[PDB]
Amino acid sequence: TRSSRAGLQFPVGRVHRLLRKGNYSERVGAGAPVYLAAVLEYLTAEILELAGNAARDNKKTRIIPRHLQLAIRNDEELNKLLGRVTIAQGGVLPNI
DNA sequence: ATCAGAATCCCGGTGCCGAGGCCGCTCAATTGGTCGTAGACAGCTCTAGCACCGCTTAAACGCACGTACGCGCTGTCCCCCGCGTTTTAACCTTTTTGG
């Protein structure tokens, strides 16, 4: 599989097919889906790292939307990235 | 009815084939940088004054804190219905002594 060749866990074939069927360009090079999969995997790893930290901070072993909201709004770079999104059941940060 | 497990089929991966998109080189010449001189309106330094921001006092009145009462999403009382057995009716049948 093309994920194994790149040492990845995200799919390369699926992403290539979505880029192909998304009406983005006439043709798609072979180095774009690998790079994009790597970026997405890095970003999800960062998100899940901070959300797991936030869930342990609450002494829970399973991540809920509240911990995702806390991880997002507590990280400056992520909170700047996800500045317009609202998370259902995410709540708000404690701020008086 | 969702969740876990068995069977298979279709979509990701291998194989091979073609055509062109784009990399590369080379050439043109526009425009962007670079400087220099001259002019003068704009910036600036400063002075001076006052008006507006900020602190302080007062008033009150209208939100919060609190106890008493209100209301449409959920608990009791009943208008409505299909269906049962019943009540009521028009009808048919049979026979009218013995010798």
UniProtKB/Swiss-Prot annotation:
The modification N6-(beta-hydroxybutyryl)lysine is found at residues 21, 80. The modification N6-(2-hydroxyisobutyryl)lysine is found at residues 21, 59-60, 80. GO terms for biological process: chromatin organization; heterochromatin formation; negative regulation of cell population proliferation; protein localization to CENP-A containing chromatin. The modification N5-methylglutamine is found at residue 89. Disulfide bonds: none annotated. The keyword DNA damage does not apply. The modification N6-succinyllysine is found at residue 80. It is found in: Nucleus; Chromosome. It is involved in the initiation of both imprinted and random X inactivation. Ubiquitinated H2A is enriched in inactive X chromosome chromatin. Ubiquitination of H2A functions downstream of methylation of 'Lys-27' of histone H3 (H3K27me). H2AK119Ub by RNF2/RING2 can also be induced by ultraviolet and may be involved in DNA repair. Glutamine methylation at Gln-89 (H2AQ104me) by FBL is specifically dedicated to polymerase I. It is present at 35S ribosomal DNA locus and impairs binding of the FACT complex. The keyword Transmembrane does not apply. Keywords: Acetylation, Chromosome, Citrullination, DNA-binding, Hydroxylation, Isopeptide bond, Methylation, Nucleosome core, Nucleus, Phosphoprotein, Ubl conjugation. One of its GO terms (cellular component) is nucleus. GO terms for molecular function: DNA binding; protein heterodimerization activity; structural constituent of chromatin. Its main location: nucleus. The modification N6-crotonyllysine is found at residue 21. The modification N6-glutaryllysine is found at residue 80. Belongs to the histone H2A family. Core component of nucleosome. Nucleosomes wrap and compact DNA into chromatin, limiting DNA accessibility to the cellular machineries which require DNA as a template. Histones thereby play a central role in transcription regulation, DNA repair, DNA replication and chromosomal stability. DNA accessibility is regulated via a complex set of post-translational modifications of histones, also called histone code, and nucleosome remodeling. The nucleosome is a histone octamer containing two molecules each of H2A, H2B, H3 and H4 assembled in one H3-H4 heterotetramer and two H2A-H2B heterodimers. The octamer wraps approximately 147 bp of DNA. This is Histone H2A type 1-B/E. It comes from Homo sapiens. The lineage of its organism: Eukaryota, Metazoa, Chordata, Craniata, Vertebrata. The chain holds residues 17 to 112 of 130 of the full protein.
